[PDB]
Design a protein around this ligand. Structure first.
Ligand SMILES: *[C@@H]1O[C@H](CO)[C@@H](O[C@@H]2O[C@H](CO)[C@@H](O)[C@H](O)[C@H]2NC(C)=O)[C@H](O)[C@H]1NC(C)=O
Ligand SMILES: [Fe+3]
Ligand SMILES: [Fe+3]
Ligand SMILES: [Zn+2]
Ligand SMILES: [Zn+2]
Length: 300
C-alpha cells in the first residue's frame, strides 16, 4: 500500500454559535467521502484552528463545537489529526491546544513544533514530516498594519527552532521529507510570500533535499514548484475562499503551477499519497470534484 493523508488549513469556523460555517461543514463532508473511497492514515491541520482568537483553555467549548462535532462522520472516526498553530491560534492560548491532546485521542499536538516519522507498508519507504510554528519564527501577522509577520517576538525562540530544524534536516535518512507551517514561503494571493520565510527557511529546503513545504494562511488552493524541484503545497481553503491574485507578480516566473480561489466555491483541501515511486497530490474542492493533481519524485 501507501501512506495517505488529508491536508486542510484555516478551517476554524467562527466565534458565534453554532461555531461552524457552511464551508467548514461542506469540507468535513467531502473529507469523509474521500476517506470512504481512498482511506486515510491521518489528517494534517495547517493552522488557524479556531477563529478569530483561538481558545481560552483546554476546556473551551470551541473544541467540541468547531472541531469534534464538525468532523463527526463515522468514516472520520479513529483517524489521527496532527496539528500545528496559525496566527489566530496565537491570539489565544496555544498551551491549551497542546494540552487538549490529553483530552481527545484523535487530537495530536505534542508541542509548538515537532518531528513525525512514518514507515510505509511493504515498501522500505520512510517519511519524515517537520511541523513548524511559523508564528514563533516571524511574529504574528495580526500585530502589524501591513498584515505581514515583520519580526519574531523573541530572538532565542526563533533562533532555536531554526537550529533544531537545520540539525534535524542534516540527519534525516527518510526517503521523503516534508516541512509544514502556517505562513507561506511562496504565494500569489492576498498575503503573498512571507519575506522572513523566504530569507530564513527556503534556503534550507533545497540544501537538504526537502520534498515539499506545506502551508495555509492565504485562503485558497495553490501548487508552486521552484527550479530546484521543491514543491509548495498551499491548502488554506477549509473555511474561507479569497479570490485575490494580488501577489502573482511577486512570485518568480514559472513557479505557479496551479491556483483556485473562486469566492463562490465552498472551499477545498488536498489528498496526499506517498508511494515507493513518488508522492502524488490531489486538490479536491468541497463540492466533490478534483481540480488538479501532480507527483513528486522520490528523494535520491
Ligand atoms: C492556557 O491553557 C492551559 C491548559 O488549560 C492552562 O493550564 C492550566 O494552568 C493551571 C494553573 O493556572 C493548572 O491548574 C491547570 O492544571 C493547567 N491545565 C492543564 C491542562 O495543564 C493555562 O493556565 C492557560 N493559560 C491562561 C493564561 O489561561
Ligand atoms: Fe486563516
Ligand atoms: Fe493565518
Ligand atoms: Zn488573511
Ligand atoms: Zn487563478
Amino acid at each position: 500500500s501507501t501512506l495517505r493523508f488529508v491536508a486542510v488549513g484555516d478551517w476554524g469556523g467562527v466565534p458565534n454559535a453554532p461555531f461552524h460555517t457552511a464551508r467548514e461543514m461542506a469540507n468535513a463532508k467531502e473529507i469523509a467521502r474521500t476517506v470512504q473511497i481512498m482511506g486515510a492514515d491521518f489528517i494534517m491541520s495547517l493552522g488557524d484552528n479556531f477563529y478569530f482568537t483561538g481558545v481560552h483553555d483546554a476546556n473551551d467549548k470551541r473544541f467540541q463545537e468547531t472541531f469534534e462535532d464538525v468532523f463527526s462522520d463515522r468514516a472520520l472516526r479513529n483517524i489521527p489529526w496532527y496539528v500545528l498553530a496559525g496566527n489566530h491560534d496565537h491570539l489565544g492560548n496555544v498551551s491549551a491546544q497542546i494540552a487538549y491532546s490529553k483530552i481527545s485521542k484523535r487530537w495530536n499536538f505534542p508541542s509548538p513544533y515537532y518531528r513525525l516519522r512514518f514507515k510505509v507498508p511493504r515498501s522500505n519507504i520512510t517519511v519524515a514530516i517537520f511541523m513548524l510554528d511559523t508564528v514563533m519564527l516571524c511574529g504574528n501577522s495580526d500585530d502589524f498594519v501591513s498584515q505581514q509577520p515583520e519580526m519574531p517576538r523573541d530572538l532565542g525562540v526563533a533562533r532555536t527552532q531554526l537550529s533544531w530544524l537545520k540539525k534535524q534536516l542534516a540527519a534525516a535518512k527518510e526517503d521523503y521529507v516534508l516541512v509544514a507551517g502556517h505562513y507561506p514561503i511562496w504565494s500569489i494571493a492576498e498575503h503573498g510570500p512571507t519575506r522572513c520565510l523566504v530569507k530564513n527557511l527556503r534556503p534550507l529546503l533545497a540544501a537538504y533535499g526537502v520534498t515539499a513545504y506545506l502551508c495555509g494562511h492565504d485562503h485558497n488552493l495553490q501548487y508552486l514548484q521552484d527550479e530546484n524541484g521543491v514543491g509548495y503545497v498551499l491548502s488554506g481553503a477549509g473555511n474561507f475562499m479569497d479570490p485575490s491574485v494580488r501577489h502573482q507578480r511577486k512570485v518568480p516566473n514559472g513557479y505557479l503551477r496551479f491556483h483556485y480561489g473562486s469566492e463562490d466555491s465552498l472551499g477545498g483541501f488536498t489528498y496526499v499519497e506517498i508511494g515507493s515511486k513518488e508522492m502524488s497530490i490531489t486538490y479536491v474542492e468541497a463540492s466533490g470534484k478534483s481540480l488538479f493533481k501532480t507527483s513528486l519524485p522520490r528523494r535520491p
